[PDB]
Amino acid sequence: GPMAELPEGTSLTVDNKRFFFDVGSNKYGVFMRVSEVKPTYRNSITVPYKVWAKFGHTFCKYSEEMKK
Amino acid sequence: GPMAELPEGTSLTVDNKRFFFDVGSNKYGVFMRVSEVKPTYRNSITVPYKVWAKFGHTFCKYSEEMK
Ligand SMILES: [Cl-]
Ligand SMILES: [Cl-]
Ligand SMILES: [Cl-]
Ligand SMILES: [Cl-]
Ligand SMILES: [Cl-]
Ligand SMILES: [Cl-]
């Protein structure tokens, strides 16, 4: 059968904490799992495609607001 | 003790799911709590200030890539 392909996952690592961005797909559509990983701890939220750009804008605006 | 006013918390709502952005401060400094809420489900990650801009860029770059 034909192959579907999603974008490559990426990470952002700080001192002793790592964030993984992983794209997935289900009956509802395409989503982003954002996982936080520490030595004894893994936790994640899932974000539908339709709000990714608004997520991006939200983080950038909060970043600028507190600049510094 | 010394006090600082943080930015106002905001939300993004979709079908049967709500995201909350809440600024906090702990022993590691300022962080963003991102909460995902459903009628009987609530979970969150916490993101230190120093990677907010890179989180923003990551979401925007992935959004554009799906064309
Ligand atoms: Cl594809
Ligand atoms: Cl990843
Ligand atoms: Cl996934
Ligand atoms: Cl899911
Ligand atoms: Cl909020
Ligand atoms: Cl944590």
Author numbering:
A (entry chain B): 213 to 280
B (entry chain A): 213 to 279
Sentences from the paper on this structure:
Since Drosophila and human PURA have a rather moderate sequence identity of 46%, we decided to establish a better experimental basis for predicting the structural effects of patient-derived genetic variations and determined the crystal structure of the fragment P215-K280 (i.e. hsPURA III) at 1.7 Å resolution. The structure of the C-terminal PUR-domain possesses the typical four antiparallel β-strands and one α-helix. Like in the previously published dmPURA III structure, the C-terminal PUR domain of hsPURA is built from two PUR repeats III of independent protein chains that interact with each other to form an intermolecular homodimer. The hsPURA III dimer shows high structural similarity to dmPURA III with root mean square deviation (r.m.s.d.) of 1.26 Å for 125 superimposed Cα atoms and 50% of sequence identity. Analysis of the crystal structure of the hsPURA III homodimer revealed electrostatic surface potentials favorable for interactions with nucleic acids. When performing gel electrophoresis mobility shift assays (EMSAs) we indeed observed RNA binding. We indeed observed strand separation in presence of the hsPURA III fragment. F233 is part of the β-sheet and interacts with the α-helix of the other PUR repeat III within the PUR domain, contributing to dimerization. Since in the PURA F233del variant, one residue is deleted, the orientation of all subsequent amino acids in the β-strand adopt the opposite orientation, likely resulting in a fold disruption of the β-sheet and possibly in impaired dimerization. In the case of the R245P variant, the exchange into proline also likely impairs β-strand folding by introducing a kink, which could also impact dimerization.
